[PDB]
Amino acid sequence: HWGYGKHNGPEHWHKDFPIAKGERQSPVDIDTHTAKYDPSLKPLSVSYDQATSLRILNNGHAFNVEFDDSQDKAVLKGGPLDGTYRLIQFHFHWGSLDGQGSEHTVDKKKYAAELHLVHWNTKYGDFGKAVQQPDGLAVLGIFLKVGSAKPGLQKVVDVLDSIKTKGKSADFTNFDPRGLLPESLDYWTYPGSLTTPPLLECVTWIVLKEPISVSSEQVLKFRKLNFNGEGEPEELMVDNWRPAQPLKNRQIKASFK
Ligand SMILES: [Zn+2]
């Protein structure tokens, strides 16, 4: 029964998921004055030309756009990574107001939203085995600010009405996740965790420096989603973000000078 309410939000998660107070929790604040350039880092390789989206699902905490991860169709390589990581889904976290919504922060700045493209390390065979490994997942995080519309997001926005409430899914084929990327692939990276229960410490985070812009109308449609199921009391799906967690014994590395 975890969520983002008064009685079940992030500050409560540790009771059911004690790793919430662990050594490698996410998100974190990215201090651009202490992150150090690492010349050993490589460019990211984002290979999404063969990506096969299948479906979009309201899971009660966000919505997931799901992909075919049964072949190396949409993969992330390079950067800080060893090996090949397959795209399984993306989702967002967003606010009730444009001044909050992101999970990571940059010099304490909160963005309006944050996109997570979730990938699992093919050496572990399946997502469920991957999340049990410290190097099981690679999550590409991308900040959203409100300004111009993002045309490559509109197909997602337009399906939201069909998945308003928890448990609803809809076919969602032929969606191109390349339309969600900024121009630059400059990034920060550090070791961390899932940002929702079970909060497993299995993620190499790759957070892009450059935000994408979405329009105020686009974000407004996200805020019409519901956390509840159909026929239950309406509770708007907003503020579905975990705040920054202590960095502890970690360093954030930058791909760029
Ligand atoms: Zn996420």
The approach used to solve this structure was: X-ray
Residue 115 Cα to ligand 1 middle (Å): 7
Cα 92 to Cα 19, 36, 197, 222, 239: the distances in Å are 22, 27, 15, 9, 11
Nearest to 252 by CA among 204, 202, 211: 204
Residue 229 Cα to ligand 1 middle (Å): 21
Return d(Cα 64, Cα 169) in angstroms, integer: 9
Return d(Cα 130, Cα 122) in angstroms, integer: 8
Return d(Cα 197, Cα 182) in angstroms, integer: 28
Nearest to 51 by CA among 66, 41, 32, 30: 66
Task: State this model's resolution in angstroms.
Answer: 1.2
Query: Does the annotation count 14 as an active-site position?
Result: no
Active-site position among 12, 61, 104, 119: 61
Nearest to 188 by CA among 27, 25, 32: 32
Q: DSSP per residue over 93-112, as a string?
A: EE-SSTT---SSEETTBPPS
* Helical ranges in the chain per DSSP H: 127-130, 154-159, 216-222
Cis peptide before 198 (omega within 30 of 0): yes
Residue 62 Cα to ligand 1 middle (Å): 8
Q: Please report, in range form, the residues annotated as the binding site for substrate.
A: 195-196
Would you put residue 63 in left (φ > 0), alpha (ψ -120 to 50) or beta? beta
Distance, C-alpha 78 to centroid of its chain? 19
Residue 27 Cα to ligand 1 middle (Å): 9
Kindly state the tokens that stand for 88: 């399984």
